[PDB]
């Protein structure tokens, strides 16, 4: 019920994905999890009268940066968040980020690839999941470090002594209810996810909401024997799936 070899990463397991002038390659694929069994059609929001700026080739590619490094030191359920689109709104965002700060609203879906190599003598497993409305930092920034902060019951007011919980609660015991995929070092080096456009309205005003956060969480602490690689860094490939932009105005310096 897996498809065919080992010591080395084989056959139907070999997968590639061309985005524009960008292409991803993996020799240890377990599959692509199209998240709600639906992709982004790239349809125009019916809330806007404004024809959209869609189909740009220079925007429909994979941006590739580094998350963190996975160590022996991480306890289970510590995570790092990567709020979309905000992560790609700056310099590392290319023409995407560029076109984005000039428009009022965006309507996109994401296609991610998170990567982490090790060896056959290394033990550990990560949980990679995508979540709509997951509680992120105020300033919609990627997590600087790994933490377990504010998990399971949310962040309540310093003064709220007996308050039961807060709305930013997150029962990590159930984190698998979100479109996810495991990154088991004995099984794979990659994780491929895809998620549709989902929001409270036909199109988003991205600058002030982060509808989706990409979470990388440890579930089974990294175990290895002396002589093996001591720190495993994690990198992610992210591509906006059929972004439809509308509400063209100025940039400046605006608010990002």
């Amino acid at each position: 019920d897996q498809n065919t070899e080992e010591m080395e990463n084989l056959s139907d397991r070999v997968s590639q994905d061309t985005a524009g002038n960008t292409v991803t390659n993996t020799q240890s694929t377990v599959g692509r999890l199209v998240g709600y069994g639906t992709v982004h059609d790239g349809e125009h929001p019916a809330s806007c009268a404004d024809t959209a700026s869609e189909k740009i080739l220079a925007v429909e590619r994979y941006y590739t940066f580094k998350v963190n490094d996975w160590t022996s030191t991480q306890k289970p359920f510590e995570y790092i968040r990567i709020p979309l689109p905000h992560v790609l709104s700056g310099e590392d965002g290319g023409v995407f980020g560029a076109t984005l700060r000039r428009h009022y609203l965006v309507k996109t879906g994401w296609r991610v690839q998170v990567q982490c190599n090790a060896s056959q003598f290394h033990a550990g497993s990560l949980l990679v999941f995508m979540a709509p409305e997951y509680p992120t930092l105020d300033v919609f920034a990627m997590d600087n470090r790994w933490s377990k902060d504010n998990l399971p019951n949310g962040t309540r007011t310093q003064t709220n002594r007996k308050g039961p919980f807060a709305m930013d609660h997150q029962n990590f015991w159930q984190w698998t209810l979100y479109p996810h995929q495991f990154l088991n070092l004995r099984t794979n080096t990659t994780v491929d996810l895809e998620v549709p456009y989902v929001n409270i309205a036909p199109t988003s005003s991205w600058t002030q909401h982060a509808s989706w956060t990409l979470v990388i969480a440890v579930v089974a602490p990294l175990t290895y024997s002396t002589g093996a690689s001591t720190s495993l860094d994690i990198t992610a490939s992210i591509q906006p799936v059929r972004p439809v932009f509308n509400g063209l105005r100025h940039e400046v310096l605006s608010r990002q």
Partner: protein, 231 residues
């Protein structure tokens, strides 16, 4: 055969907007024929498209903006928020009608009537700027949004329409504290070229300012504004 009935709890209640009739007391009253009658409307939407006057220099409001013989780019001629709750629209029917409702959707049309001398010439840049990066601070910053260039000539007025650009299918009609659902940009007006004239003619001119609802405008959920007094 008396019929057994289960009396609901909510019994005895009076509902102000209840969708039903009550007891008649004077039946078979024939009315006085009024068939010679003209001028009836059946929808508010039917008369919401007639432009009424925007108030400039509020509170000493004047139904016009004034064009100069100088086209500064850093200085607009008018800047209006696109919200039915603006002080500018406060006495237009669009605004007076709208205020009896909860949400709106569709196009708003701003009509500009040139009232200067026929000898006079000018060119204005009118733009609509969606929220996100504040209000434009120059014509140069404005021109990056939806705009139109209005050239003066044999045709006196120009009709500008602000496109319904929004996340939400509808928008809140009264601004209270601004929010993502409330407001939606700004309309600014500027002289591209200055207003020109030959000798013997006034150096400035008044442009009548009106507003109406476009073919696209819709309003839903009837309610009631906060009680006021014009005095």
């Amino acid at each position: 055969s008396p019929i057994p009935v289960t009396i609901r709890e909510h019994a005895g209640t009076w509902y102000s907007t209840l969708p039903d009739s009550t007891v008649p007391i004077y039946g078979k009253t024939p009315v006085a024929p009024a068939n010679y009658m003209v001028g009836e409307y059946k929808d508010f939407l039917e008369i919401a498209q007639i432009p009424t006057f925007i108030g400039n220099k509020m509170p000493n409001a004047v139904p016009y903006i004034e064009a100069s013989n100088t086209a500064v780019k850093t200085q607009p001629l008018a800047v209006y928020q696109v919200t039915l709750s603006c002080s500018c629209l406060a006495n237009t029917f669009l605004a007076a009608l709208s205020r009896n409702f909860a949400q709106y959707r569709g196009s708003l049309v701003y009509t500009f009537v040139f009232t200067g001398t026929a000898m006079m010439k000018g060119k204005f840049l009118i733009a609509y700027t969606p929220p996100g990066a504040g209000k434009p601070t120059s014509r140069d910053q404005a021109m990056q949004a939806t705009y139109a260039i209005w050239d003066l000539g044999l045709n006196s007025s120009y009709s500008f329409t602000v496109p319904f650009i929004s996340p939400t299918h509808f928008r809140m009609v009264g601004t209270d504290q601004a929010n993502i659902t409330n407001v939606d940009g700004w309309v600014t007006v500027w002289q591209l070229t200055p207003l020109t004239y030959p000798p013997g003619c006034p150096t400035s001119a008044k442009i009548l300012t009106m507003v109406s609802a476009g073919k696209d405008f819709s309003l839903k959920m009837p309610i009631s504004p906060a009680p006021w007094s014009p005095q």
